[PDB]
Design an enzyme around this catalytic site. Structure first.
Site, PDB file in Angstrom:
ATOM      1  N   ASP A  35      -5.898   2.547  -3.583  1.00 39.33           N
ATOM      2  CA  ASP A  35      -7.121   2.642  -2.802  1.00 39.33           C
ATOM      3  C   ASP A  35      -7.215   3.940  -2.014  1.00 39.33           C
ATOM      4  OD1 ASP A  35      -5.049   2.002  -1.129  1.00 39.33           O
ATOM      5  OD2 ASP A  35      -5.847   0.046  -0.528  1.00 39.33           O
ATOM      6  N   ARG A  36      -6.174   4.769  -2.037  1.00 39.75           N
ATOM      7  CA  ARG A  36      -6.161   6.059  -1.364  1.00 39.75           C
ATOM      8  C   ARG A  36      -6.255   7.184  -2.385  1.00 39.75           C
ATOM      9  NH1 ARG A  36      -3.256   6.164   3.229  1.00 39.75           N
ATOM     10  NH2 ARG A  36      -3.243   4.259   4.502  1.00 39.75           N
ATOM     11  N   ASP A  41      -1.064   1.053  -4.062  1.00 41.10           N
ATOM     12  CA  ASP A  41      -1.959   0.083  -4.680  1.00 41.10           C
ATOM     13  C   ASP A  41      -3.273   0.689  -5.158  1.00 41.10           C
ATOM     14  OD1 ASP A  41      -2.788   0.555  -2.074  1.00 41.10           O
ATOM     15  OD2 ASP A  41      -3.687  -1.438  -1.861  1.00 41.10           O
ATOM     16  N   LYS A  69     -11.564  -0.167  -1.267  1.00 41.95           N
ATOM     17  CA  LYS A  69     -11.654   1.262  -1.522  1.00 41.95           C
ATOM     18  C   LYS A  69     -10.905   1.611  -2.802  1.00 41.95           C
ATOM     19  CE  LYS A  69     -12.792   3.276   2.912  1.00 41.95           C
ATOM     20  NZ  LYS A  69     -13.788   2.180   3.086  1.00 41.95           N
ATOM     21  N   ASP A 116      -2.013   6.385  -3.805  1.00 42.78           N
ATOM     22  CA  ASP A 116      -1.002   5.663  -3.057  1.00 42.78           C
ATOM     23  C   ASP A 116      -0.445   4.512  -3.900  1.00 42.78           C
ATOM     24  OD1 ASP A 116      -3.335   4.031  -2.863  1.00 42.78           O
ATOM     25  OD2 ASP A 116      -2.508   3.108  -1.048  1.00 42.78           O
ATOM     26  N   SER A 158       0.854  -1.193   0.000  1.00 46.26           N
ATOM     27  CA  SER A 158       0.000   0.000   0.000  1.00 46.26           C
ATOM     28  C   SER A 158       0.887   1.238   0.000  1.00 46.26           C
ATOM     29  CB  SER A 158      -0.991  -0.097   1.161  1.00 46.26           C
ATOM     30  OG  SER A 158      -1.950   0.941   1.093  1.00 46.26           O
ATOM     31  N   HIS A 159       0.817   2.096   1.012  1.00 51.55           N
ATOM     32  CA  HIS A 159       1.515   3.372   1.033  1.00 51.55           C
ATOM     33  C   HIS A 159       2.960   3.266   1.504  1.00 51.55           C
ATOM     34  CE1 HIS A 159      -0.657   2.606   4.783  1.00 51.55           C
ATOM     35  NE2 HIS A 159       0.322   3.239   5.405  1.00 51.55           N
TER      36      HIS A 159
END
Ligand SMILES: [Mg+2]
Length: 568
Positions: free
Chosen positions: A306-307, A304, A403, A302, A131-132
């Site tokens: 989702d942000r 992946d 998300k 981000d 992710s981030h």
């Protein structure tokens, strides 16, 4: 040239053997709500770590659902993603998996993985992302496992994976399997002692996801918005992450925004050497270009995908807690919600109550959940949740079970096209209609644990004293409630406590403390309605409650931190 030589060689080698190799179990492969993230050398250098975890994922699935089933595999583009994906192909072949649908070069955003899983009727998917977190040889690496509904595996499944991994003794692999992740199309392999061939379908990373989003929104109005002469100058910063190709194909090529609109939209194995985290800290370059005043809309994604971070002209940063509230107050500017209707709103507890304003103005129900996807997906599968968002730059709907950042960008673009107003003007109208929920969050990353846990315990016992509730503090706030947030899930009867120290004031303001080396999270949310005091600097109007939080928690004296690492 091209598949010919590979096919003839595949025929000459004959069927590929499937072999069982012995292994020793590790005792820290415990996947949480966001999968299993360690340093990259854990998966790259530690022997059989990756093999142990992947084999544990496969063993977590019933044999009846494993044989001919399809499994989506994809990542964000990190260092070591490709080779680990190759290992996933070999082990998946030896574990008797029907077909692996993989994005080209292993590139599939988490929302894309959810979409493809729910589309092709797959048993699940393996997402290679942290992710981030930063990526690279000295960075972080992660593995997520989603199930047939498209969302992350619940605690029982991630558990079973962990308990299996603590006791794993061997694994099955097809070592001589060689798959080219670069060329689209189907590739089959003859497995030894198996009559059915194994299938690996390399699919376009963007096609299916872009088709879903094309069914969600009105791409014509977006064409008139982003590609016209009187176009909305947007500056999309993918932070060298997974969303870059999607921005190029969807926003730029299909919707017609010219190439200037996108930046950092080429996925790099180290994300360009920076943290792919969209906030005011790690994405300060984007806010600094937005300071110029030429672009009307900005956004950041981000690792992946989702942000999302949403900025207006001159860097008018809109906080996620507010952003989901604006998307909810204009939810019928999206054809999808026109079709489905609004079944319910929801936010994480540390998120500001700006969503509750539009949830109480309308009568769509609102659910306040802890941090994590389990509760959002629980309410989604019960047709009780339609739009959700969390302060951690999270925004999504029930179109998938993850998300989606680019989906939120397209939602904001739809709202701008419908209302024909600037971001700042729209949020001014929102703040005057519902009253502004001033929200801020401080991140003190990687402070030493024992002192942080001791602070949360001593502070917790300070809240539990009955002499605390009622007592006032001067700028004047009065304490009403003080507890440790807990939540009874209305779908499966699940319980979850120690979800954060909640302090509710009679003013309606809330001070929340949470603990994630250890990271300390300070959430502050005050409400204000009178029109003369809703257009101020939020740091100034919030400085009282920030001072109360830091002084009551005694955080600096117990951590030595001077300022928080991240501001929101
Ligand atoms: Mg993420």
């Amino acid at each position: 040239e091209e598949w010919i030589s590979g096919t003839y060689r595949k025929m000459e080698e004959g069927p590929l053997p499937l072999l069982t190799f012995a292994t020793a179990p590790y005792h820290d492969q415990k996947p949480g709500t966001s999968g299993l993230r360690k340093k990259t050398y854990y998966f790259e250098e530690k022997p059989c770590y990756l093999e142990n975890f992947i084999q544990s994922i496969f063993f977590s699935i019933d044999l009846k659902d494993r044989q001919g089933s399809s499994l989506v595999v994809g990542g964000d583009g990190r260092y070591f993603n490709k080779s680990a994906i190759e290992t996933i192909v070999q082990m998946a072949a030896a574990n008797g998996i029907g077909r692996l649908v993989i994005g080209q070069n292993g590139i599939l955003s988490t929302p894309a993985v959810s979409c493809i899983i729910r589309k092709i009727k797959a048993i699940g998917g393996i997402i290679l992302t942290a992710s981030h977190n930063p990526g690279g040889p000295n960075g972080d690496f992660g593995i997520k496992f989603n199930i047939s509904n498209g969302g992350p595996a619940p605690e029982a499944i991630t558990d079973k994976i962990f308990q299996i991994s603590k006791t794993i003794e061997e694994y099955a692999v097809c070592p001589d399997l060689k798959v080219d992740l670069g060329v689209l199309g189907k590739q089959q392999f003859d497995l030894e002692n198996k009559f059915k061939p194994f299938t690996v379908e390399i699919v376009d990373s963007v096609e299916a996801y872009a088709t879903m989003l094309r069914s969600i929104f009105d791409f014509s109005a977006l064409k008139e918005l982003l590609s016209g002469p009187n176009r909305l100058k947007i500056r999309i910063d993918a932070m060298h992450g997974v969303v870059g190709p999607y921005v190029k194909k969807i926003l730029c090529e299909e919707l017609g925004a010219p190439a200037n609109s996108a930046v950092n939209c080429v996925p790099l194995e180290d994300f360009g050497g920076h943290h792919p985290d969209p906030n005011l800290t790690y994405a300060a370059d984007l806010v600094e270009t937005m300071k110029s005043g030429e672009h009307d809309f900005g956004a950041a994604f981000d690792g992946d995908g989702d942000r999302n971070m949403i900025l207006g002209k001159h860097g008018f940063f809109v906080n996620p807690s507010d952003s989901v509230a604006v998307i909810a107050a204009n939810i019928f500017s999206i054809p999808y919600f026109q079709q489905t209707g609004v079944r319910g709103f929801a936010r994480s507890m540390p998120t500001s109550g700006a969503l509750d304003r539009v949830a109480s103005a309308t009568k769509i129900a609102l659910y306040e959940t802890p941090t994590g996807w389990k509760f959002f997906g629980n309410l989604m599968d019960a047709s009780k949740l339609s739009l959700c968002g969390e302060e951690s730059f999270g925004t999504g709907s029930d179109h998938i079970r993850e998300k989606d950042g680019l989906w939120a960008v397209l939602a904001w673009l739809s709202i701008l096209a419908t209302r024909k107003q600037s971001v700042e003007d729209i949020l001014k109208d929102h703040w005057q209609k519902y009253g502004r929920n001033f929200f801020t969050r401080y991140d003190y990353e990687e402070v030493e644990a024992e002192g942080a846990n001791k602070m949360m315990k001593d502070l917790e016992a300070l809240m539990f004293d009955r002499s605390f509730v009622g007592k006032q503090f001067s700028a004047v706030y009065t304490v009403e409630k003080a507890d440790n947030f807990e939540y009874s899930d209305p779908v499966d009867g699940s319980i979850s406590r120690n979800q954060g120290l909640r302090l509710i004031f009679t003013d309606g303001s809330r001070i929340v403390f949470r603990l994630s080396g250890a990271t300390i999270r300070l959430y502050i949310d005050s409400y204000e309605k009178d029109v003369a005091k809703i257009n101020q600097d939020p740091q100034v109007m919030l400085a009282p409650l920030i001072s109360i939080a830091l002084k009551v928690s005694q955080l600096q004296e117990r951590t030595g931190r001077t300022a928080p690492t991240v501001i929101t």
